[model samples]
Target chain A: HMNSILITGCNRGLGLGLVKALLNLPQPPQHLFTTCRNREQAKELEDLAKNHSNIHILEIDLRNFDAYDKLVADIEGVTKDQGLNVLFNNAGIAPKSARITAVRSQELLDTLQTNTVVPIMLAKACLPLLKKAAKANESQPMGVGRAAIINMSSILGSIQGNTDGGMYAYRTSKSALNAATKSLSVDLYPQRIMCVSLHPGWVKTDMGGSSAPLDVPTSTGQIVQTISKLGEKQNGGFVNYDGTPLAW
Target chain B: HMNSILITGCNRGLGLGLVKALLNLPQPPQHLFTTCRNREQAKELEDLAKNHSNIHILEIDLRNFDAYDKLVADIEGVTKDQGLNVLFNNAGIAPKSARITAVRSQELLDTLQTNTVVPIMLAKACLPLLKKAAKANESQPMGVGRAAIINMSSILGSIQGNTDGGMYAYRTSKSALNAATKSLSVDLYPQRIMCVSLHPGWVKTDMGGSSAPLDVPTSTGQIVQTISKLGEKQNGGFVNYDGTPLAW
Candidate 1:
């Protein structure tokens, strides 16, 4: 549905798999900007960029919010009249450090910075570009989704208060991200830039572990399809990669 | 009312003022354990401790979760029989670094560590004491608020999804804190320890600045009154200092 796209944390795992899947879409993005912490270390992304002129890999440390302007400017420069139609805040980190007690304070803070605030910062940075794309595609038929901001959240973020306790840092951070996703979606609706939170499920990644039930390609492919399926009317919903609604 | 009270960040305007008003209450908390960041720097609080035999001032950096157990142990040692009846998680802050942009990243993380996570850790650390107080005072019928956790939140933290965008750190931290408060309250409800979030309005303080409408006494006094008014049924509720419920 969207041709000009930007995805964060697109260097490896689900991000990398998602990148591969999006590139393979029947209507592949015309200008796909894949961003990560280090460009040179993004080996697969680098390899892919070499094979395709549309794949532009950029170095972006989401924690350094001050760098957002430069990232947006460079993206704006590349897209020119094309406009940015999708911004996937897929970059998130869940430390290998597990939690049972009140320990892991550093993990809690750092995880929230990266997994929660950083992604919203990325969304806020790309808001104008998303708005431009929305306006450009305003007359599109109802079936197609237009400019959208997709936030990566998790089912573990739910506060139904009926689950296994402890993963404090990762759980709290993702919950906060979900809350902010809903907050931003309402504010962004006027611009017709639909925003929604997503759960990637138990994908087999370094974060999810090798024993995870779902493989990267299966999960990432479904996630991409869900993102594509989301229309303006779906604003503020929290859904899974499999297109199921999740509890907040 | 509460006989054993623990307050955090009691050196400044609202927190300090809340401590003073609580100390002067009709029941006059039999054991008042006030935790501040610095002992010597809290000049007036140290003086207040010297003047009141019941006032127990302990230096605690709430950001350090490791230090919580020792602080709780010391408080329990003093109260011995009374147990902790009230926990006022009143510590919070805002930097001069404002934001409509996503530029203030570091401040956001640091602020959340102190303003958000620290308070919840404090509550969790004192769960035993709260449960003890709840069980002990269960037969009190209608005269007491029993055991309770009060988190100082702000109207600015409201996620009605309508607002001027800025203070990403303070706002989201409090919102996340609110989420945690609900989670904790539900987990603690069966134990009879009521937990609620409170907005003290805009009060004049170093953080709120001079032109703020409400003075310390006006806001903190009302907040104390609200705490005194809370009952077992108020678990997980978010309220204003005037005893009115606020949006989640």
Candidate 2:
């Protein structure tokens, strides 16, 4: 059973799906902290929280790094001495102008900030707790059950995998995120904190669009399963929902 | 022979070395447009320009995208209708706090803007001229001599090569830049404009520090040699100064 878990951008789509999947696990998390930009808009999440006492919805606009301290403090209050086991950085955006020529300056900046910078800073903010979790489970081997930072990336981020080559902003941001993930994995290795970039296959969501073949549940189920099986061997890896490794 | 070539950050270091190397080239560019943040501070470049009529130094602070139009206009004025053959995006920064923990928010944003965003936007601004160059030499197969965008990326950017893991800002920005290079190669393929990311190995410069093994001349010489030989095969590829491929 997971001790404590936190996920960003649980308002809807894959983020929501992951939350539901986690709850449906054989042994649900003792304290599952979910964050959404707007509490009111996350009606479904709020309903889930009401039924399952394990669910704790926290409001946080990920764009604003200033709110990170307060958000982490809230998580600190809930997790207490147990600390945090996992931090799922899932919030991101895919701008309509995927082409390099059409992507605007603001769009590029905003997307990078949201998809790359925020996650890095958020991980930094939550480091103390992640360390606590790692130290607390010192006897156990490194894995998600101990302490992990799973960055929600995309296959489009893989420069080697980018044969078609579009989605300039999204691709750049996710690649940057993956770069950060590798560094994070190396730096946090001593602490036994497992870090990985997970590319959940294009699921049928607001960002993925209706044409996307994989449903939210199927994608998230694979993600949850993949994440659960993660160990030192998988650290610093870029993998698909089914734990298949991806090229950088 | 290169009809017209534009290079950014030609005041000193590898950029300056490249300018000198190109001037000493057997054929040499008919029109060489070099840019730096400050014209007055570039005493060596000024001296070189004083003797060489082909060396047209254009003032541009790449951090400001607003100056791109004016910069391109200056190039257009000089090139007349020949258009630009090559654009070397060499200007970049290596932030002091390479470690993830010490890297600040503004630092990350600024680095990404300068290293990644500027190059992509500058390429967009110069696309018309690049396309014009392609059409001007339609009979010629795609190569740097015809039309190309060579992004001065680094080995540090290669996520796969990143075993040590540090330099969060620099790595992220350059990787993002590499990602952009691949996309640019694909999108601009029909126009026959080649695009590639070149990692000039750790050279002894202000950024590289005195401990760096390779001299600026050696690195820039290899870069010039490698770039001169680049064709469709090298497009969308990340390579060393000697044209040796690097993992993405």
lDDT of candidate 1 over B1-248, digit per residue (tens): 77888888888988899888987788788888888878989998898999988899988788777888799899889876668888888888887645334345667678789877787678778878887788888876322357888888887666553345455677678777777677667666666777788889889999888999999999988888877877766667778889887875
- Superposed on all Cα atoms, the candidates' RMSDs to the truth, in angstroms, are 4.2, 1.0
lDDT of 2 by residue, A1-248 (tens): 56899999997999999999998999989998899978888999999998999999888788787888898899888887778999999999999956666768888898899999999999999998999999989888888889999999999999987888778888999999999999999999999999999999989999999999899999999899999998999999999999999998
Q: DockQ for every model, please.
A: 0.27, 0.81
Off by over 4 Å in 2: none
TM-score of each: 0.81, 0.99
- Each model's interface RMSD (Å)? 3.3, 1.0
Q: What is the TM-score of chain B in candidate 1?
A: 0.94
lDDT of 1 by residue, A1-248 (tens): 66788888888888899888888799888888888887868888899999988888889787777888999999999876656888888888877644333445677688888887787778778877887787888876321256887888888776553245456677678767876776667666666777788989988888888889999889988888888777756677778888787766
Best by lDDT: 2
Give the CAPRI class of candidate 1.
acceptable
